[model samples]
Target: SEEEIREAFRVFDKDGNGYISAAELRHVMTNLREKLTDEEVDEMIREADIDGDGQVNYEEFVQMMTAK
Candidate 1:
């Protein structure tokens, strides 16, 4: 699953930037056939983002995936 996450991130993050923004994230959710609400997307970003930053850096994503 972790490996899959990496690939998913890679596929969805087509901007070629290491950091991910809401646009890319929401796009992925829509692709999965899920019309997620702000909280739905926020929850994951919330858990991953610290220091009041809006974007989820690749480093943060690494930490995000390890969370229980």
Candidate 2:
């Protein structure tokens, strides 16, 4: 689970920066047809961003998935 989750976070993290900034994640989370509204994207990141940095660090990317 850890490895799978790490690489999955890898995909979204784009520049391989250890964090997924809002701009990068928007592409993945807000795919065509605009599935999630601007606010909708804000909420999940708001939920996952541990220090309110608005970036998802390693652990909470899995939290975003597994919390359900």
Which candidate achieves the best TM-score against the true structure?
1
lDDT of each: 0.59, 0.60
lDDT of 2 by residue, 1-68 (tens): 44665576678766877887656555555553355687887777655444566665664555554443
lDDT of 1 by residue, 1-68 (tens): 56655666778667757767666655554454344676677676554443457675664564555456
Off by over 4 Å in 2: 1-6, 12-17, 31-39, 43-55
Q: On a 0 to 1 TM-score scale, where does candidate 2 land against the true structure?
A: 0.42
| Count of clashing residue pairs in every prediction | 0, 0
lDDT of 1 at 45: 55
Query: What does each candidate score in C-alpha RMSD?
Result: 4.5, 4.7
TM-score of each: 0.48, 0.42
- Candidate 2 — which pairs collide? none
